[PDB]
Amino acid sequence: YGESLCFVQHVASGLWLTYAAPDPKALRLGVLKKKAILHQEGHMDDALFLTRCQQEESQAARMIHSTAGLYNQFIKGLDSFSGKPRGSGPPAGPALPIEAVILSLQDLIGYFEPPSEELQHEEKQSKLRSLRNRQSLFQEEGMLSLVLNCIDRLNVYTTAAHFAEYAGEEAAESWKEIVNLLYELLASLIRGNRANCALFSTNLDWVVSKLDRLEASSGILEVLYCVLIESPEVLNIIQENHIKSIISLLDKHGRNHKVLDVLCSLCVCNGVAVRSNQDLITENLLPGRE
Amino acid sequence: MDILELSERLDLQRFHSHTLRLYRAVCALGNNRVAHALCSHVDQAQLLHALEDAHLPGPLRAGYYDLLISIHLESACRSRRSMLSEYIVPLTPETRAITLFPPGRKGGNARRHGLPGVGVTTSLRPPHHFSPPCFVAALPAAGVAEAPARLSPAIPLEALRDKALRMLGEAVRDGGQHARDPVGGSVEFQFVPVLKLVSTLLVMGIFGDEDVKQILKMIEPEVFTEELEEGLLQMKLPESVKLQMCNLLEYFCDQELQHRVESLAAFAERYVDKLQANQRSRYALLMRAFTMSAAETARRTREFRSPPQEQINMLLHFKDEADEEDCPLPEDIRQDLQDFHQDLLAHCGIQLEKKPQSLQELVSHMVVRWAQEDYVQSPELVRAMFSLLHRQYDGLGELLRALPRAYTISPSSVEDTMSLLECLGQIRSLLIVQMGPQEENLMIQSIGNIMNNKVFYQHPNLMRALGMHETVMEVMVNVLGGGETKEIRFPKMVTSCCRFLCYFCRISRQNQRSMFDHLSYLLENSGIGLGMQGSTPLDVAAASVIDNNELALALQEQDLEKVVSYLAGCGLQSCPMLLAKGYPDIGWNPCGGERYLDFLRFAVFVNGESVEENANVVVRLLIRKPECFGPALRGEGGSGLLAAIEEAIRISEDPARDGPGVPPEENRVHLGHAIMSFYAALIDLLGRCAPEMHLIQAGKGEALRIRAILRSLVPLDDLVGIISLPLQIPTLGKDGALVQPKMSASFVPDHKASMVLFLDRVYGIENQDFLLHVLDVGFLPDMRAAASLDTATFSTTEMALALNRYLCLAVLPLITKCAP
Amino acid sequence: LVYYEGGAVCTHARSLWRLEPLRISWSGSHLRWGQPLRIRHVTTGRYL
Amino acid sequence: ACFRMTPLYNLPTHRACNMFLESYKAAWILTEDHSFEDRMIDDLSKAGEQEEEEEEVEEKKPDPLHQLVLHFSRTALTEKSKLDEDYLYMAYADIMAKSCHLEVEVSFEEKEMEKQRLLYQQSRLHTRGAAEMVLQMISACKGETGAMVSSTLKLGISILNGGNAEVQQKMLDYLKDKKEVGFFQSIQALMQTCSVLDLNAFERQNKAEGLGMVNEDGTVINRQNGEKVMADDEFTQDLFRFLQLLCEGHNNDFQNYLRTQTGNTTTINIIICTVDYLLRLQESISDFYWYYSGKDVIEEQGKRNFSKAMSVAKQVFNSLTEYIQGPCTGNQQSLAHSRLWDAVVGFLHVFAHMMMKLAQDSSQIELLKELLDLQ
Amino acid sequence: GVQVETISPGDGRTFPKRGQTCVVHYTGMLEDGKKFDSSRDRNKPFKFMLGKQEVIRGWEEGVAQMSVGQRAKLTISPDYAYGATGHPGIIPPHATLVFDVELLKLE
């Protein structure tokens, strides 16, 4: 296990598991991803070398495999009850596992602690790059996109009762903490993740649109705060409308240290300043003084 | 509400602190317009009375202090630090006057070290430019972001200086008192803001000499006494305040090193004058010593025949004592030099009461004592501590490092160096901030002023010591980083990037050496320079490599490999800007290939001779990459180069096949002439890459086979046909107006010149009948063209002049060697 | 479809693969040359 | 120009002062010898009033040297995608290297006393975490050639000189506990990027001195730079000397660990990769043999290139000997099955034709001596 | 377009003539009365040259209407003032201004 060179053979076919080799025009495509085929003749390098994987990575893969299916079932249930309001009638279908979803979320955040600051620098760095590694795999298989789908399909319904007339009354009480914990999970996943902050750099308008929503204002604001801190590209892509939206958010939700810190982080990043962004912030906020 | 009540009400106080942080962020990094806006929003006397008030809570106190710094002090502090890192010394009578040690009754070798920061520092430092803040004036008529950025708000510097000094005195009084209630709720909140303001003012240099004396007295009285009280060092501080203390003392030691450098420059001035007078006397005895002695005169001559650098080298070379008896310099001019050398050793501390009475031992002792007192938990303070400790223990080595940066300038050019340094300060400040239109206009005008600047021509070593080209390349790459593949922002910017640095190339070859050192770094970024029109990092690398055979030899095979990989890509596909603009599609890109080919030409051909290793490796790369040949000479199913030229002329005759069909900008190239230029540059590349005739008679097998391979790959019949091809000549038409087919739309005799250059370089000309038929089929069309040229209108137009250069560079040398 | 790829995708969990012996018990016993077995991708859950 | 030159008295004063400043720099500041590292290190190591308090020693507070070493360790353990240049670490690593090494009939007592002093000087640092910090800094180097790893390896040499058994034990234990493959990956990357002799670069340099046109600054004809051939010879030498010092004293456990690391998720063979580098160096030396046999006599620049390459090869052979001694049976068998034999045959024929052509003429006697030493 | 209220009477025989520098001491408030700029803030009087129009033309008109040694309150309409644009950042766009002016000495 880790030093042997191994051939793999198929019992039923009796042929040799080989690589299909670079077929014509694959060079023009430039893709280094090449198909495997099954042929008795095989190729010279048909022997495989097997190498170890960490138990942390194995557990991460297993939890990915289970989580994808669970939240996929949840999204299909969302689609099932999205079309027609149930009204004063039972959904007449398998109810989504709300409690299993709940437990899965706090399990994920319990997998996603930020390191405690009291820990020494060595173990701090160790758990830091371990967490970065897990976040990289999780965005690679893209359960973050699945979380985005869940968030969108939940926030199409403005209120817990509004969700209830379509899905059921028992989910209405859970709905608030469901969306809050989902935003918290997304923040935990994206915090300190280059890939996730790059994804939000691609699509910031999602957070810009859902920031005004009251139900999870703190969670969405913390998400935006982490994205703005970690990613300088988001600050480049920000236009005047986004800054005005954040100022309107501060107006509608009152004075907030978190919101003001978000604006501070928007101002400057990595020791390089965007004069256009600073000028927009000034012209929009300061001259009023109210 | 009262802010003193806000002190008890922390939540609203916390919001006010976050407001202060936001104000700092918006005014930060030299955004002067927002700085003046914030100066209007927050009253200045408010900031002053806030500095006065001690009842104000500590976090808001630190916030007000840092806001004052980020409104007034930040930009001047940054520019001053950037200029202070570098040491430039002018020539002055005051410079002559200044020395390492002040004379006194105390023995010269044993003199008390002078208090740091007192005396005259002749180093040219940019006068801080401040704008009187008045926001009721008329609005500027000039457009926004194109008008120059305006200065930072003005402050009463002298009153602020005295106020900060007496605040530090109050801090000393409180430290002596050891009162239970600290100012701002903590000793840190009491000391850190005041120390930061003191640091900023010292960086400004507004603090006078006597002010520096009082600052040293407060920092440590007994150590800096001039001839109970307690010292800021002994009364002990928390970690962060110790960090601010280390920053202050690091600044003072920076002025200590500055004093060493300037005194050394002064001594250099005096000793150079003494050496010049001695050599004037010696040569006066030398034109006389030609008669008395022959061997003495001969050895004096061969000594002077060495270059002036070597002459000064041998004149100075008497420290080792091995040839101190040998050196002709007088023993007194030796002795004063050794005396100053021992003085410098003592001042640096190389030579080895209980209180240190020296900055060296003072810093060492305080660092060591702090280390015994506590184990520092803050890595930044640890690094500052140990860096300062190393500076103190070995400042002489740091002096050795700083000396190459040191340089001397004349008082006659000091005013021009002033403007040069100001523009440098603008550039270095601009590097910090990201891209903007105002920033691009500012740097363009600044580098224009630098290029116009006379000292820039006068002192080639001065901008070498400055190293502005590195920072210019840094701003280049920061602009290039964002979204480079799709489109390049501001080809105006990149064209400026050359005209400045590409002209720096044109100015010097040691400049070419530096850009050759940074050549590959420009090469990975050359993948956008070809896409942008005009001056490119590709051509800055070409201008660096050109005309220096040492650079041509030192050229790297892997760098040429990635360049020819770029060439292979552009030969694989046409450019996406072409595709987006909608010009007729081509399977490959001719223009990028052509520009890479001319770069390779400048690489292979230097000073009028080809370089053998680079030529051979370029042939290797060419045979590695058949895609570089484009459609012409395809190979299997191969339409020849002559047929491709025929189809290119067909396309040129065809309307809208070269153009958009919707050159209004004229920057866009006609596609047919782009193809013809590509293949002309390719043929010229193979020609100038072929080895020379002397190597041919030497009979080296690799050279012979390379020449044969070039002949086989490019058949001579294609060359003969291209020479034979009739070419449109600007003729009189439309009732007698000279109808001029522009070069971009028509095939050109400079392409024909590349053709004949490959011919006489590779195929050569060997037979009389071969020469005769080449003449009467291809050179006689040229010569009838010259017959047409012998006209007043033809002589007026520039294509006749182009044909004149064509003949004199290509046909005339060929004809001269064909004379037999 | 499963392909042969090289890069960060190798480090990613998509490159992980798992082996299951046909015999239910003592699966964790030492592998033997030519032993009948099944291949499963851990994240997908599908059997190749 | 010999008559043309403006005499220094008629020469402009500012440019003359620049000239003289550079001259005085080169002739005086470099030649002035300043010894400060020993006193710096002993002052840092001495802990004043620590025993006087006697509670802080019970808490085990680091003395200033230990604090500095822990700061460097913190910087190393801090993770960056790109390694960060640290002038402070270069300065301090140089200081510690001097403090350790501090360096004609000598008696037994004097030799033993010198050995004990060297051991104590090594102790002052390795008792403070120096070896672990060096391993961390190589791991942070990650296999990029630079002053970072140059100073790190020099400090490793300075602490491991003489085969410090306790330093070797601490390094092995640290590797076994952290158990991170990145250190060995960095070693392999550095040893792969170690350069080999190049005929092309040598000939380019030859044409360089042959042409040798004047430099623009003043009059500098054919200014000679450091030879492009064997640019990193000192780095290859001190890296292989680091491996030699690690295996010094016939430390069988560490030799086996270098061969294979049992528990690490991926194991690489430093022995085999060192054999690969030796084989590449042998091919390069064979290329110089063919080029030198091309002409009748050896020219001086090529003589010096060949001598420096021979010094590198000597370091490689000493490292291999330290690997295989003990005798470590596993290392012996791995080397036997490795590609060593082909490289050894290559060195054999190369050496034969060497001493032939070298004994042909008298001037090559010193290179012949070095040849015999390598053989 | 400028409304003038004389808090302290001017002498009436000495007047600022076009082409003579004026040393004034001003205080600037907004529509609702918030102070954005003032010479009191600098503690140094503001000096301006009549006729170069370096400051707002409505304000030069008000100063010209003013006598020497006078304290007054001047309301400037937007069209004479910054206008619809205001002063970017300092004065909100499309806002009129009201200034309080001291004229201690005239040279």
DSSP string, B705-765: HHHHHHHHHS-HHHHHHHHHS-----EEETTTEEE---TTTS--HHHHHHHHHHIIIII--
Residue type, A65: H
A289 near E CB under 8 A: yes
Chains in touch with B (3+ beta-carbon pairs under 8 Å) read: A, D, E
Interchain proximity A61–C13, CB inside 8 Å: yes
Interchain proximity B312–D75, CB inside 8 Å: no
Rg (alpha carbons) of chain E, rounded to whole number: 13
| H or E, element range at B724 | helix B716-724
Would you call the peptide bond into B57 cis, given omega within 30 degrees of 0 as the criterion?
no
DSSP A269: E
Phi, psi of A24 (to 5 degrees): -60, 145
Three-state DSSP class for residue D63 = coil
Nearest to D3 by CA among A31, B98, B307: B307
CB B453 within 8 A of CB B419: yes
- Cβ contacts of A281 on chain E, cutoff 8 Å: none
A180: exposed, middle or buried (Cβ count in 10 Å: 0-12, 13-18, 19+):
middle
Neighbours of B470 (CB within 10 A): 10
Q: For residue B463, what are the contacts with CB-CB under 8 A and spacing of at least 6?
A: B456, B469, B504
Among candidates E43, E53, E90 on the partner chain, residue whose Cβ is nearest the Cβ of B135? E90
Resolution limit, Å = 4.0
| H or E, element range at B807 | none
With the CA atoms of B557, B560, B561 and B566 taken in that order, what torsion angle do they form, in degrees rounded to the nearest 10? 170
Q: Which two tokens stand for residue D174?
A: 């640290």
DSSP tally for chain A: helices H, then strands E: 14, 6
Do C and B touch (≥3 CB pairs < 8 Å)? no
d(CA B398, CA B74): 27
Helices (H), chain D: 13-24, 37-45, 50-53, 56-59, 64-77, 87-101, 108-126, 130-141, 147-160, 165-178, 182-193, 199-211, 233-246, 252-259, 270-294, 300-324, 329-337, 340-360, 365-374
Q: Please indicate if the annotation marks D22 as binding a ligand.
A: no
Rg (alpha carbons) of chain C, rounded to whole number: 13
Q: Name which of A32, A59, A63, A139 to mutate to probe chain C: the one with the most chain C Cβ atoms within 10 A of its Cβ.
A: A32
Residue type, D284: S
Q: For residue B119, what are the contacts with CB-CB under 8 A and spacing of at least 6?
A: B98, B209, B259
Among candidates D9, D49, D218 on the partner chain, residue whose Cβ is nearest the Cβ of B372? D49
d(CA D121, CA D119): 6
Q: Which two tokens stand for residue C46?
A: 């599908």
Q: Which two tokens stand for residue D350?
A: 């190369």
d(CA B124, CA B89): 7
Q: Which two tokens stand for residue B645?
A: 């030229």
Q: How far is A283 from chain E (nearest CA, A)?
A: 5
Interchain proximity A11–C12, CB inside 8 Å: no
CB A130 within 8 A of CB C2: no
Determine the Cα angle at B39 with ends B38 and B40, to 5°: 85
Interchain proximity B550–D213, CB inside 8 Å: yes
d(CA B323, CA B244): 50
Interchain proximity A268–B432, CB inside 8 Å: no
Nearest to A246 by CA among A260, A226, A227: A260
Could you list the active site residues of E? 26, 36-37, 56, 82, 99
Q: How far is B622 from chain A (nearest CA, A)?
A: 19
d(CA B540, CA B529): 10
Q: Which two tokens stand for residue B729?
A: 């000549």
DSSP string, B10-57: HHHHHHHHHHHHHHHHHH-TT-HHHHHHHHHHS-HHHHHHHHH-SSS-
Per-residue HEC secondary structure of B478-512 comes to HHHHCCCCCCCCCHHHHHHHHHHHHHHHHHCHHHH
Q: For residue A205, what are the contacts with CB-CB under 8 A and spacing of at least 6?
A: none
Q: How far is E10 from chain B (nearest CA, A)?
A: 23
Q: Please indicate if the annotation marks D322 as binding a ligand.
A: yes
Interchain proximity E88–A286, CB inside 8 Å: no
Q: Residues in chain C, how many?
A: 48
* Residue D96 β-bridge partners: none
CB A84 within 8 A of CB A163: no
Whole-angstrom distance between the N-terminal and C-terminal Cα of chain D? 52
Nearest to B494 by CA among B512, B469, B473: B473
DSSP B184: G
Q: Which two tokens stand for residue B557?
A: 């095979």
Three-state DSSP class for residue A231 = coil
* B:D CB pairs within 8 Å: 171
- Cβ contacts of A4 on chain D, cutoff 8 Å: none
- Cβ contacts of B37 on chain E, cutoff 8 Å: 88-90
**Elucidation technique:** cryo-EM
B45 near E CB under 8 A: yes
d(CA A288, CA A58): 56
E47 near B CB under 8 A: no
d(CA E82, CA E88): 10
d(CA B555, CA B612): 12
- Cβ contacts of B134 on chain E, cutoff 8 Å: 37, 42, 46
DSSP string, B291-326: HH-SHHHHHHHHHHTS-HHHHHHHHH--SSSSSTTT
Neighbours of B235 (CB within 10 A): 12
Q: Which residue of E has its CA nearest to A281?
A: E89
DSSP B70: I
Phi, psi of B738 (to 5 degrees): -70, 105
Among candidates A283, A288, A289 on the partner chain, residue whose Cβ is nearest the Cβ of E88? A283
Among candidates A3, A52, A125 on the partner chain, residue whose Cβ is nearest the Cβ of D78? A125
CB B231 within 8 A of CB B219: yes
d(CA B161, CA B207): 7
Q: How far is E6 from chain A (nearest CA, A)?
A: 30
Three-state DSSP class for residue E105 = strand
Do C and A touch (≥3 CB pairs < 8 Å)? yes
| H or E, element range at A173 | helix A170-190
Q: Going from the N-terminus, what domains does chain E have, and what CATH number goes with each?
A: 1-107 (3.10.50.40)
d(CA D48, CA B772): 99
Nearest to B44 by CA among B156, B149, B138, B167: B156
Interchain proximity D267–A2, CB inside 8 Å: yes
Q: Which two tokens stand for residue B454?
A: 């006379």
DSSP B669: P
CB A135 within 8 A of CB A189: yes
E13 near A CB under 8 A: no
| H or E, element range at E12 | none
Going from the C-alpha of E52 to that of each of A177, B330, B656, E48, E55, the distances in angstroms are: 67, 68, 57, 9, 8
Q: For residue B358, what are the contacts with CB-CB under 8 A and spacing of at least 6?
A: B113, B349
How far is C-alpha C2 from the chain's CA centre?
A: 12
CB B622 within 8 A of CB B571: no
Among candidates D79, D265, D267 on the partner chain, residue whose Cβ is nearest the Cβ of A125? D79
Q: How far is E78 from chain A (nearest CA, A)?
A: 17
d(CA D229, CA D204): 10
Q: For residue B488, what are the contacts with CB-CB under 8 A and spacing of at least 6?
A: B480, B494, B528, B531, B532
CB A163 within 8 A of CB A157: yes
- Cβ contacts of C12 on chain A, cutoff 8 Å: 136-137, 140-141
Nearest to B646 by CA among B718, B731, B753: B718
Interchain proximity A141–C44, CB inside 8 Å: no
Q: Which two tokens stand for residue D250?
A: 């016939």
Determine the Cα angle at D175 with ends D174 and D176, to 5°: 90
Q: For residue A111, what are the contacts with CB-CB under 8 A and spacing of at least 6?
A: A63, A134
Neighbours of B161 (CB within 10 A): 18
Interchain proximity E89–A287, CB inside 8 Å: yes
d(CA D97, CA D87): 15
Going from the C-alpha of A127 to that of each of A116, B183, D49, the distances in angstroms are: 10, 41, 38
Neighbours of D156 (CB within 10 A): 28
- Cβ contacts of B489 on chain A, cutoff 8 Å: none
How far is C-alpha A161 from the chain's CA centre?
A: 27
d(CA B367, CA B538): 51
Interchain proximity B307–D218, CB inside 8 Å: yes
Q: Which two tokens stand for residue B239?
A: 């970690």
Three-state DSSP class for residue E80 = coil
CB B410 within 8 A of CB B91: yes
DSSP B73: I
Q: Are strands B407-409 and B88-90 parallel, antiparallel or unpaired?
A: parallel
Q: Which two tokens stand for residue B403?
A: 């000396």
Among candidates D77, D265, D266 on the partner chain, residue whose Cβ is nearest the Cβ of A125? D77
d(CA A179, CA A185): 10
Q: Are strands E46-49 and B605-606 parallel, antiparallel or unpaired?
A: unpaired
DSSP D311: H
Phi, psi of B213 (to 5 degrees): -60, -45
Counting Cα atoms < 13 Å in the Cβ hemisphere of A145 gives 8
Max CA pair span of chain B: 112
Q: For residue B272, what are the contacts with CB-CB under 8 A and spacing of at least 6?
A: D13, D16, D17, D20
Interchain proximity E55–B40, CB inside 8 Å: no
> Which sign does the torsion angle of CA B109, B113, B119, B122 carry?
positive
d(CA E40, CA E63): 18
Q: Name which of D11, D19, D203, D217 to mutate to probe chain B: the one with the most chain B Cβ atoms within 10 A of its Cβ.
A: D19
Nearest to D230 by CA among D284, D298, D270: D284
Q: Which residue of B has its CA nearest to E54?
A: B138
d(CA B18, CA B16): 5
Going from the C-alpha of B320 to that of each of B314, C40, D32, D84, D325, the distances in angstroms are: 12, 78, 10, 40, 48
Q: Are strands A272-273 and E97-105 parallel, antiparallel or unpaired?
A: unpaired
Q: Which two tokens stand for residue B455?
A: 């000292």
